[PDB]
């Protein structure tokens, strides 16, 4: 349904075959499905219609909270406590958002594996590639910080990685 965006959680076009009866015998599954429909799906639908009718008479909205962007930990003086506090809060929010991004990608991967059935090893290559990329990025950013993590430790990790990459690049240039 329209509850979620179908671009963030995509699905294939859902091709299903038409029934081709080849026996004179009746199909018990169809008879049981008709019984289940008429006996379960209709009263539930009526109850849902009543509940939605009651809901439409009382409609109110809640809004997603917006946050502005503040200076990062790089634009803060060494002992400036207030700027450090704002930067740390913003960094923590970004960490939560990145965790949720990884969660979305993992949900895509699991849904693909279940959906594709016996052809999952070939039909889910793109989702596996996306998860590998996002996992590599996330791992670089936050792994090994440990408990008592902060924006300063993440910055130190990034600086160390940049220094190593610069040295490797300059030594490969001399080759």
């Amino acid at each position: 349904p329209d509850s979620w965006d179908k671009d963030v959680y995509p699905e294939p076009p859902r091709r299903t075959p038409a029934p081709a009866p080849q026996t004179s015998l009746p199909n018990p599954v169809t008879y049981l499905t008709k019984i289940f429909d008429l006996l379960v799906d209709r009263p539930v639908t009526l109850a849902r219609e009543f509940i939605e009718q009651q809901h439409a008479k009382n409609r109110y909205y809640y809004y997603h909270r917006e946050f502005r962007r503040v200076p990062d930990i790089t634009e803060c003086e060494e002992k400036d406590i207030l700027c450090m506090f704002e930067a740390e809060m913003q960094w923590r929010r970004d960490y939560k958002v990145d965790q949720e991004i990884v969660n979305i990608i993992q949900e895509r991967l699991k849904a693909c594996q279940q959906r594709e059935g016996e052809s999952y090893r070939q039909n889910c290559a793109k989702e596996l590639e996306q998860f590998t990329q996002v996992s590599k990025a996330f791992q670089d950013r936050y792994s090994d910080l440990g408990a008592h993590y902060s924006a300063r430790k993440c910055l130190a990790k990034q600086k160390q990685r940049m220094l190593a990459e610069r040295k490797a690049a300059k030594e490969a240039a001399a080759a």
């Binding site: 599954v29 049981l32 379960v40 799906d41 993992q106 699991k110 594996q113 059935g117 999952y120 596996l128």
Partner: protein, 606 residues
């Protein structure tokens, strides 16, 4: 909305209503057991519909309905997998539980706590469904430990009897040894694949390393009582016969094999773990079939038969045929439960006697019980066109046509001969010959509950193999080309076992008495495994936990070093300082020494 999911969830949900009714005025009446039995039968007939949907269109589903909690990158949610294994195992388990509850309505009629017993049986069934339908490792572990605790409570049903409590604790010990490997697998999968759910695990492990699979194998060996951790299953016969028929024969003990079947995509890509599984299954089935052929308690014989069939299931998994192993589970449930039920009928008729040496000629005194036991024995031995045959025959012929360990093949063949030998022993000893039971004959099997239950399981044991084999899609590549002699290998070895056991049982009529050999003593005393492993490790563990952990360290040396040394030193210095005679001469001389030292030591250095 495609009723598959709603029906699969309702089947599991309606099983809990009698549990919620356990504090109402139905639990204090005598209508509670029939109420529980009716609930289980209704659950079975409801679960029959998703099975039909699957058999028609192959439909499968996963349902993640409740999000329990979320970690930074790991999401844990209540999820149910409704694939072929779940939708096939649920109706079989419900059918067997219905039959066994109706049997228990007659077997445990004189028990003052039958309502509690029925509640307990129902609780075990719920935990087993949780285990079977679980989609993530945490839910599967919940079901695992639930069935373990339920079996602990049902084994020690007669809690005033020391041996029952010992058997229950032994079962807990062995299952905890397996739980170690289960937890190892969980930790490895979370730290390497970042998930506990099944779909993610399959995707991220194209070539699974040794450690998680070895952990899974250890857990399966614990739960299915393989050779390392076998002895607890025979000792679980301390519980009432319905517990032995439901839990320790057909449903709860296949949990390890089911766990290995669930993770078959990972086991498919590791040869070493497959070889270890094959060898473990082979040694287990051979050893237990060898122990069974000389047992005198009938429940012990059926328990060892169950352990040997679990070993055969493990062998089937070891040759990369998990679907055959699942089919064998479903096939074996029927006749194993009905065999235990017939054993319970015989036990109840002969004033709670279990020894076969005091059971005489019941072929005529017990016609329906004899018929059911004969049919079950013939099905267990894989007689052609019976339920046992559509799984065991294919298992044997698939072991023969594979690149496999030769010793494992030999042990599998010897074990499948010993199966017919032990089955023959029960029939010859229990049903043929002349009476050996006390003279006050109370034999009476005319009770509609017993007849109906055993008749239902008998129809199952006759027709389920054909029906289920013809109603499942082909998930294997068949062996269509065999040498004629190898195609008949199972039949030949079964017939040889039959004839050899018949000769060795006929020679007992002779008026000749010779002392037993050492081979007989080894077979009868279970290879002395419980005689040594339940005395040496336990003795050394308990003796060391008293002499060293409690006494040597905690009560002596840890006391000696920190607090006793401090007290001794403080007391000695207190005695030194405080014991002066009070003579001004001595400490004024002390003052002189102090004054002189002070000028030179601290005063000369300015």
């Amino acid at each position: 909305m495609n009723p598959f999911a709603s029906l699969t969830l309702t089947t599991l949900t309606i099983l809990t209503i009698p549990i919620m009714m356990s504090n109402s005025n139905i639990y204090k009446t005598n209508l509670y057991p029939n109420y529980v039995k009716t609930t289980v039968s209704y659950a079975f007939t409801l679960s029959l519909v998703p099975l039909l949907m699957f058999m028609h269109t192959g439909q499968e589903m996963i349902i993640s309905n409740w999000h329990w909690m979320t970690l930074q990158t790991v999401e844990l949610s209540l999820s149910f997998k409704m694939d072929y294994f779940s939708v096939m195992f649920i109706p079989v388990a419900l059918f067997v539980t219905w039959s066994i509850m109706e049997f228990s309505m007659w077997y445990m009629h004189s028990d003052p706590f039958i309502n509690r017993f029925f509640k307990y049986l129902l609780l075990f069934l719920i935990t087993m469904m949780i285990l079977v339908t679980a989609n993530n490792l945490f839910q599967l572990f919940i079901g695992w430990e639930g069935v373990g605790i339920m079996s602990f409570l049902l084994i020690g049903w007669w809690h005033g009897r020391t041996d029952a409590n010992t058997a229950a604790l032994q079962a807990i010990l062995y299952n905890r040894i397996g739980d170690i490997g289960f937890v190892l697998s969980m930790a490895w999968f979370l730290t390497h694949s970042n998930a506990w759910d099944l779909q993610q695990i399959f995707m991220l492990n194209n070539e699974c390393p040794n450690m998680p699979l070895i952990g899974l194998l250890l857990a399966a060996a614990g739960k299915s009582a393989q050779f390392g951790l076998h002895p607890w299953l025979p000792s679980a016969m301390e519980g009432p016969t319905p517990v032995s028929a439901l839990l320790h024969s057909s449903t709860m003990v296949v949990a390890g094999v089911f766990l290995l079947i669930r993770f078959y995509p990972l086991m498919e890509t590791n040869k070493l773990v497959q070889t270890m599984t094959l060898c473990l299954g082979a040694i287990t089935t051979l050893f237990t079939a060898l122990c069974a052929i000389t047992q005198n308690d009938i429940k012990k014989i059926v328990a060892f038969s169950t352990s040997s069939q679990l070993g055969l299931m493990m062998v089937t998994i070891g040759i990369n045929q998990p679907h055959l192993a699942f089919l064998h589970i479903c096939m074996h449930a029927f006749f194993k439960a009905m065999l235990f039920m017939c054993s319970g009928s015989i036990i109840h008729s002969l004033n709670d006697e279990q020894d076969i040496r005091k059971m005489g000629g019941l072929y005529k005194a017990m016609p329906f019980t004899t018929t059911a036991l004969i049919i079950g024995s013939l099905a267990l031995t894989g007689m052609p066109y019976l339920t046992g045959f559509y799984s065991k025959d294919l298992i044997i012929e698939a072991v023969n046509m594979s690149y496999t360990n030769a010793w494992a093949l030999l042990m599998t063949l010897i074990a499948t001969s010993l199966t017919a030998a032990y089955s023959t022993r029960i029939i010859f000893f229990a049903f043929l010959g002349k009476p050996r039971f006390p003279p006050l004959v109370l034999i009476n099997e005319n009770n509609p509950l017993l007849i109906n239950s055993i008749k239902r399981l008998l129809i199952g044991s006759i027709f389920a193999g054909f029906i289920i084999s013809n109603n499942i899609p082909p998930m294997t590549v068949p062996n269509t080309t065999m040498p004629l002699y190898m195609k008949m290998t199972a039949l030949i070895v079964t017939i040889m076992g039959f004839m050899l056991a018949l000769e060795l049982n006929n020679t007992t009529y002779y008026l000749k008495f010779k002392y037993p050999s050492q081979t007989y003593k080894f077979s009868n005393m279970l290879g002395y495994y419980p005689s040594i492993m339940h005395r040496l490790p336990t003795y050394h563990n308990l003796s060391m936990s008293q002499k060293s952990a409690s006494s040597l360290l905690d009560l002596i040396w840890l006391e000696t070093i920190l607090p006793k040394t401090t007290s001794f030193i403080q007391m000695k210095m207190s005695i030194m300082v405080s014991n002066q005679k009070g003579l001004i001469k001595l400490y004024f001389l002390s003052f002189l020494i102090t004054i002189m030292i002070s000028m030179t030591l601290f005063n000369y250095h300015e």
